Amino acid sequence: LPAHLQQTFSPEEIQFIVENEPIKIFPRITWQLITTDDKALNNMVAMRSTEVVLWIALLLKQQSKCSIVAPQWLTTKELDRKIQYEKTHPDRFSELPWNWLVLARILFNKAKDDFHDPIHELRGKIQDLREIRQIKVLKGLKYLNESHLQLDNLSLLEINELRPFITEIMDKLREIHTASL
């Protein structure tokens, strides 16, 4: 019996989920491990790009034996066209890595060192897009009615925290109207 949350996913859970996503890195390394579902790999070439699951990358990076690739989608200069595209589209939320919130929080824990001036940089940049995305949630949130929601593009993290909000809502709405029938 979970008690809490328990219906919504924990942010610690969803990040625990996003850990499962594969990404390329630059190992210092040159048994097996067989593991289970990895399928990878032959002992990896030092200073070479290879796609691997996220949390394992945290491992060798935790020993600093590996160098994680920066997301191509993660370019602050590149990200402005999104906020550019976002600032000109009051409706659409544009495009998302879909895990990216936890990433940046996690990316800057350790892997921060790999990027060029991530410091004092995207954190603000990402933050602006974070709320401008978030603000557009509530602005469209006034439209909220049963039985349909066009949620479109949103980061699941905020989607998770918003879960208790609307899920508790429309059920009232759907109930009250349908009950009214």
Partner: protein, 104 residues
């Protein structure tokens, strides 16, 4: 429960008499019921603990006036008051439930 080696509901649920005997009967019978599921796993579970997802993997815990060492399982960590360790999430999960562990 609570968790090793709980090793028993004894001292746990201090209410005891304060809670109605019919229920303490039920619950004490109920916890034995979930122990039946423990026969099912065979996982191993260990669902009574392991509430938090793993990380990462090692952590530093300090004893809280707890000795010890009761650490017979695996190996003895030699419980000493005012002593922080460096250990993996796995074994910590049991002692943290037993209050012998403090810091993360």
């Amino acid at each position: 429960n609570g968790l090793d080696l709980m090793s028993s509901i004894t001292f746990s649920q201090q209410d005891t008499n304060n809670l109605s005997h019919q229920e303490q009967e039920y619950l004490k019978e109920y916890c034995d019921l979930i122990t039946d599921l423990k026969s099912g796993d065979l996982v191993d579970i260990d669902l009574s603990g392991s509430l938090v997802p793993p990380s990462d993997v090692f952590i530093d815990v300090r004893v809280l006036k707890d000795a010890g060492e009761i650490q017979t399982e695996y190996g003895v960590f030699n419980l000493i008051k005012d002593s922080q360790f460096f250990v993996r999430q796995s074994d910590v999960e049991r002692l943290i439930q037993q209050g012998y562990l403090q810091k993360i």
